[PDB]
Symmetry: C3
Subunit: 92 residues, 3 copies
């Protein structure tokens, strides 16, 4: 009977330890992220991958310059056409 | 003996609870994501970071326009070279 | 008493199993990721989203070409201005 009495005492401590350990795990699991809600390394773009990313302002800077050239080229077409007539007129 | 009998009954319920609690944690852990497979907030680019991203079609749009200008500039070179000769011829 | 003796034996094995099961979970939790440190699917850009990303070298390539055109257009302006004076001069004298 004293053998059984001790066993019970051993079980009590063991159960008590388990209770504590499970409680911890309960708390700790609260802070963990689910597979559903989180994104994998394989399917996500790192900050490394976008280090050499072009902005919409870089492109805007180029658009600006393109427009300026486009405008200058139009003016030149106008000037050249006029000169062709002027030279033609001179030849007659 | 009735004291020990009750203790055993108390342990039984406690063990039963723990069994359930651990099973839950087993299940719940199944849906959690590992550190290895998931990507950290620090090393991943958010949708905010890529809000002002330039596309390859923005650039294609610019390339198109560049090619058009390139053609117009060639034509102009041709027209101007001819005019220079025509004017030179007129001066002699 | 032998009924109680057996119950205790049943509890011992069950406790022993639980001890092992909890230890595993302890270990396994060590390799799991926290909500704080990880990034959600909703707030992160996938490799799909950046498949059509423009580089800074693409842009550099365009800048190079733009500069070449810019130079040619300046030269043309110069050539045309000179011709206008030359033709004007021809019309007067």
């Amino acid at each position: 009977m004293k053998q059984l009495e001790d066993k019970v005492e051993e079980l009590l401590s063991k159960v008590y330890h388990l209770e504590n350990e499970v409680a911890r795990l309960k708390k700790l699991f609260a802070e963990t992220a689910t597979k559903a809600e989180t994104a994998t390394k394989a399917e996500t773009a790192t900050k490394k991958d976008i280090a050499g990313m072009a902005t919409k302002h870089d492109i805007a800077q180029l658009d600006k310059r393109m427009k300026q050239l486009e405008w200058k080229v139009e003016e030149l077409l106008s000037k050249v056409y006029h000169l062709e007539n002027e030279v033609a007129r001179l030849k007659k």
